[PDB]
Amino acid sequence: VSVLTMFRYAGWLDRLYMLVGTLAAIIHGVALPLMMLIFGDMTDSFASVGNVSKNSTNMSEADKRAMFAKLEEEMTTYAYYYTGIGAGVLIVAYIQVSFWCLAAGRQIHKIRQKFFHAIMNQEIGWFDVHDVGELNTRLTDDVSKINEGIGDKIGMFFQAMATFFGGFIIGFTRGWKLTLVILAISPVLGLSAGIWAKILSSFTDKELHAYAKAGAVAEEVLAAIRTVIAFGGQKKELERYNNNLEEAKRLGIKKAITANISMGAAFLLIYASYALAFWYGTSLVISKEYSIGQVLTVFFSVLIGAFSVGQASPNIEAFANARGAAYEVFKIIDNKPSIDSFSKSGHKPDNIQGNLEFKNIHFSYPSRKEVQILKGLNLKVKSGQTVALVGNSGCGKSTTVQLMQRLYDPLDGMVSIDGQDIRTINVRYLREIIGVVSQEPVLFATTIAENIRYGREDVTMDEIEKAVKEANAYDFIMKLPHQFDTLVGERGAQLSGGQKQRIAIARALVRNPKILLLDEATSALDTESEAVVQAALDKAREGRTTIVIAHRLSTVRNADVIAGFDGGVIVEQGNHDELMREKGIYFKLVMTQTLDEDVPPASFWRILKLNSTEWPYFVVGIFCAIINGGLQPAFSVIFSKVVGVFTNGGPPETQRQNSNLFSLLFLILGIISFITFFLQGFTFGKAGEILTKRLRYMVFKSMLRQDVSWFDDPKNTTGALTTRLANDAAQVKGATGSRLAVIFQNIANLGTGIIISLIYGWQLTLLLLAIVPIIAIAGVVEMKMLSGQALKDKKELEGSGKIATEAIENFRTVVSLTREQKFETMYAQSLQIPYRNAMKKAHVFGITFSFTQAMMYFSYAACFRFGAYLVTQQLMTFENVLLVFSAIVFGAMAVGQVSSFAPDYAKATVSASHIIRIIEKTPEIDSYSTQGLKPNMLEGNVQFSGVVFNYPTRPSIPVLQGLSLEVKKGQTLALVGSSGCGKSTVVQLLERFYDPMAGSVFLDGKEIKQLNVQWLRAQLGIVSQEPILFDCSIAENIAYGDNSRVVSYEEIVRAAKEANIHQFIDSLPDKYNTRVGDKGTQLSGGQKQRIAIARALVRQPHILLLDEATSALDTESEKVVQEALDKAREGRTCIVIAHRLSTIQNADLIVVIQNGKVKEHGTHQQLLAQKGIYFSMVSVQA
């Protein structure tokens, strides 16, 4: 039902078609087993020609006729066999594929629209809950999974029956109890293989979980890189837990891996067992009773049936997932909650004009338990009036304003617009009649002309003009290139928040409702802009009854009536003066405020060599692999022999022949395999281990010893990075295992296939090889056309998706809701294109697939016919055809490889290339010399010469152009400028995180450019904006193991002492052993920073780098900070850059630098004596 039905819902001819194609499928599966019967009949007559050709010591002419008659006889049987099965195949396959698509196609598309629009209709709820980025995510993700649900399904049916009727058909109709001996031994052994192999395949997955755990405990926090460099390099830790848990779950998962190799060994062991019981039980049931040397037909066939069962399984799986996640989220789809709002008909209010009425409205947010912010609210506003609301505590003001848009619904009481109940009037009509301007001026990724269009569909640039002109925007818009026809560059991040809001107005203004609300929309914006804005508001208000919420009591003045609020508390209402004269709330407050990487440069064999390096040696590996190749050919021939001697040879010892070859095949494959595998498993496996481990190490280090523009200015987050760790270590592991499997299959197939290709008959040799490369090339072009169509498809659907996103994501549309559908409409457009495009491709796959099959029966019919060719009186055409099985299934061997084992070597290579280039690096500052920390460098006079720099992004114009400063010893070097850059960049330069473009610095003598980077970073005391510390124990944080700097207890104590954080150190559970607790999410920036300080001073710098240290704080925190900073400074050189135009006075040398160049400098009252720059700073400061 719902689950499956609803899943498979919608489709007149869709459904019908569906069934049809399905039928085709069935016939298809059945097609291959009947195919096996043919194997029979032809091979049977072949056998008879083998015993009459094996007699040979008698009539020569009777052999001419008898054997030739048999030739053209089966030659006819051949034509008709492949012809039938074949053409059929081509046809049926084509049909079904059409099923998959067409069906699922139309289906999806439908589900498409319905989901878009549904979402669009869940109202507030999609705000209420949801993660809304998550919502659309599943839009795309889930829909797709459903589609794949319908198509793979078709697949499942196909094979489901291939094995059902196959195993039946042959597995009964041809044996009557022999087909059964099959049934017995065959179905049985199949059970054992599937069984043990799955038990440890699952054991394998348990290995993948314990594995992911070792990995994270091998991940750790690697962000805060900066602070990190101003610290040195963890580098032991990472390695410690890294190789630790790795090595462990390595050998171990590599044990279960060698166990999956003990699995491939099991399966091949068991399979070998297949041969045992197979050939044995036959040998008997083919020597004694039922003598046809054909039984193999049945046995072999049904076996194939068990395999259909398997392939059947993954398809099913797909049906499941698609089904599942699809129907359950489809439930979150089709579902029509709605009702708390809607968008369909209603009560039409054409009376125009009216007054807002809030009569006893109690309300609680959707989050059930939350406290009813609107504990019975009574408020009513006349028309044409400008009524404001005042608040500050948060929640209620908005909440209410909100309700007025019938956004959520009242928990009790009612709201009457004009004189009717809002909940009565139509929603759209309502929402329309309601012009609102929240604060966030959300704009679209289109032309302005458009955003306004959105305001109201039909409309001429005429009106628009007027609107924008009444929304006072007609100007800047004109000065703006391209005019109204100008776009908003990818989202609304191109113009000034102000203008934006303005436009919104215009927009809403075009709406021209009769009710207006301003959710602080002036709020969060500079002054001047603010005033112009409010201006617009007014010109838009007073012609329309309005209500506003704002902390700008000023613009609140001209309030026709103020409402007393503060976090949900309805009190004093009335004109300004009345509340002021009310010495209460209004009055009160009035007086209180006064992940895309992807890189071209690959590496041909470059990875292999690096590969070989990271590889100690394991000829053993390649070796055993090789022999494994030799093994496949072995089996193939072993069979060719078996069937051979049996169908054409001497009557006595047919038993020892069978019993042997059979046992042979057994011991051979089985034993040789289990061993070849297991052993290789352990070897190559280890390779993967050390490689991954060692690899990570080197790499990560490369990062450690890496820096400069990298992390200082990264476009490579801590995630893409860590990921690099995991994913890429695994991938190189890939390059190795592959090279291994490569040589294997090769020599395997090539080497042996060819030696056999020699014992061949020159027929097959050429013909067949022609067939393998051919069919192979088909499989490759197939995969290519399939992924190509999949990629471009994701492209068109991407465009449609993104837009969809913009909408949903930006629900602030339902704000005006005059688009909902309109939106969805546009999508239908986009969607229409990739839809017709879908049908086309549908067909494609069809033909493609069907052609695969074509080459299938094709190549085997022409191959077998040509084989049998000339068998008149006993020519060079006999049992060797099995040797044909050899070369052919060897092609099937190559496919066993490019289809199994290691990754397709593609992404393995990418990730390899990446991880390499990275580990390569180009250090940039590591061991060195460039001095000797001579016992006379303890000065500090930092000297800045030329100072011309700009971090990698030079086309952004150097943020340091021709600069030069200086700071004596043991004093205070004040620093002030415009904002953001300049200050920091300077501190950094000292840290020499980026050697300037031209210039240099003298710590006190030698040249920092040419000074021992390390040491230069030994004596430094940076305390920047956002403080940070790993999740160690604070005693550990403090005792910042800079270098040899052993965790000196009385030393770190000394740190908490001067760092002023000893107040906490004293008590606070444990005392000095208190970890940062949860990574450091249990303290105030004042405490952290203090430790930051504790850091600095515990290092005993000779230079203090204060980068606007305390920018976000308060009270005794900024106080005890300026104190510890006061006692931690003056005893040594210290640059104090900041935005503390307040405690910037007490500075030995205040330097006003103007981004790029220095502008003023000197003692405070002197800089003040030079009125203008520094002056205008103390003045704007006020």
Ligand X SMILES: CC(C)[C@@H]1NC(=O)c2c[se]c(n2)[C@H](C(C)C)NC(=O)c2c[se]c(n2)[C@H](C(C)C)NC(=O)c2c[se]c1n2
Binding residues for ATP: 391-398, 977-984
Instruction: Report which residue's Cβ sits closest to ligand X.
Output: 896
Residue 159 or 555 having the CB closest to ligand X? 159
- 1137 bridge partner residues: 975, 1107
Q: Which helix or strand (DSSP H or E) is residue 511 part of?
A: helix 497-511
Residue in the block written with tokens 């043991």: 970
Q: Is 749 in the site for ligand X (CB under 6 A)?
A: no
Q: Is 740 in the site for ligand X (CB under 6 A)?
A: no
Selected from 100, 116, 635, 682, the binder of ligand X by CB under 6 A is: 635
Binding-residue pattern over the window 896 to 915 for ligand X, x denoting contact by CB under 6 A:
x--xx---------------
Residue 139 or 268 having the CB closest to ligand X? 268
User: Would you give the DSSP letter of residue 1096?
Assistant: H
Is the CB of residue 591 less than 8 Å from the CB of residue 633? no
Selected from 18, 90, 268, 322, the binder of ligand X by CB under 6 A is: 268
- Tell which residue, 146, 154, 153, has the closest CA to residue 332: 146
Which stretch in 173-181, 791-799, 887-895, 1008-1016 sits in contact with ligand X by CB under 6 A? Answer: 887-895
Which stretch in 83-91, 409-417, 432-440, 891-899 sits in contact with ligand X by CB under 6 A? Answer: 891-899
Is the CB of residue 325 less than 8 Å from the CB of residue 384? no
Beta carbon of residue 642, minimum distance to ligand X (angstroms, whole number): 13
Separation between Cα atoms, residue 1017 and residue 274, nearest integer Å: 70
Beta carbon of residue 46, minimum distance to ligand X (angstroms, whole number): 20
- Strands in 1103-1107's sheet, in edge-to-edge order, are 1022-1023, 1103-1107, 1133-1137, 972-976, 1149-1154, 1157-1162
Q: Is 632 in the site for ligand X (CB under 6 A)?
A: yes
Beta carbon of residue 789, minimum distance to ligand X (angstroms, whole number): 24
Residue 312 or 1055 having the CB closest to ligand X? 312
Q: Is 1144 exposed, middle or buried (0-12, 13-18, 19+ CB in 10 A)?
A: buried
Residue 308 or 405 having the CB closest to ligand X? 308
Can you read off the two tokens belonging to residue 580?
Answer: 């002021």
Helix boundaries (H) for 1059-1139: 1062-1066, 1085-1099, 1115-1127
Residues that contact ligand X, how many (by CB under 6 A): 11
Q: Is 892 in the site for ligand X (CB under 6 A)?
A: yes
- 358 bridge partner residues: 379, 415
Q: Is 1104 in the site for ligand X (CB under 6 A)?
A: no
Separation between Cα atoms, residue 321 and residue 924, nearest integer Å: 50
Beta carbon of residue 311, minimum distance to ligand X (angstroms, whole number): 8
Binding-residue pattern over the window 1135 to 1154 for ligand X, x denoting contact by CB under 6 A:
--------------------
Q: Is 893 in the site for ligand X (CB under 6 A)?
A: yes
Residue 570 or 863 having the CB closest to ligand X? 863
Amino acid at 165: F
Residue 307 or 476 having the CB closest to ligand X? 307
Can you read off the two tokens belonging to residue 659?
Answer: 């019993």
Can you read off the two tokens belonging to residue 51?
Answer: 């015993």
CA 163, 165, 168, 174 torsion: positive or negative?
negative
Beta carbon of residue 768, minimum distance to ligand X (angstroms, whole number): 15
Can you read off the two tokens belonging to residue 234?
Answer: 């963890």
Q: Which long-range contacts (CB under 8 A, 24 or more apart) does 1111-1117 make?
A: 1111/1025, 1111/1138, 1111/1139, 1112/1025, 1112/1085, 1113/1085, 1113/1086, 1117/1084, 1117/1085, 1117/1086
Separation between Cα atoms, residue 1030 and residue 871, nearest integer Å: 83
Beta carbon of residue 992, minimum distance to ligand X (angstroms, whole number): 57
Which stretch in 840-848, 889-897, 934-942, 1141-1149 sits in contact with ligand X by CB under 6 A? Answer: 889-897
Selected from 271, 760, 849, 905, the binder of ligand X by CB under 6 A is: 271
Which stretch in 555-563, 830-838, 886-894, 904-912 sits in contact with ligand X by CB under 6 A? Answer: 886-894
Beta carbon of residue 313, minimum distance to ligand X (angstroms, whole number): 12
Helix boundaries (H) for 705-763: 709-712, 718-747, 753-759
Q: Is 889 in the site for ligand X (CB under 6 A)?
A: yes
CA 849, 852, 854, 856 torsion: positive or negative?
negative
CA 121, 127, 132, 134 torsion: positive or negative?
negative
Q: Is 887 in the site for ligand X (CB under 6 A)?
A: no
Beta carbon of residue 692, minimum distance to ligand X (angstroms, whole number): 23
Q: Is 527 in the site for ligand X (CB under 6 A)?
A: no
Residue 726 CB contacts under 8 Å (≥ 6 apart), including other chains: 215, 219
The pair phi, psi for residue 518, each rounded to 5°, is: -125, 105
Residue 230 or 889 having the CB closest to ligand X? 889
Binding-residue pattern over the window 275 to 314 for ligand X, x denoting contact by CB under 6 A:
--------------------------------x-------
Beta carbon of residue 300, minimum distance to ligand X (angstroms, whole number): 9
Which stretch in 134-142, 703-711, 885-893, 1053-1061 sits in contact with ligand X by CB under 6 A? Answer: 885-893
Beta carbon of residue 634, minimum distance to ligand X (angstroms, whole number): 10
Which stretch in 105-113, 286-294, 890-898, 1079-1087 sits in contact with ligand X by CB under 6 A? Answer: 890-898
For the annotated binding site, the residues are: 391-398, 977-984
Beta carbon of residue 102, minimum distance to ligand X (angstroms, whole number): 29
Beta carbon of residue 172, minimum distance to ligand X (angstroms, whole number): 21
Instruction: Please give the residue ranges that form the binding site for ligand X (CB under 6 A).
Output: 268, 271, 307, 632, 635, 889, 892-893, 896, 899-900
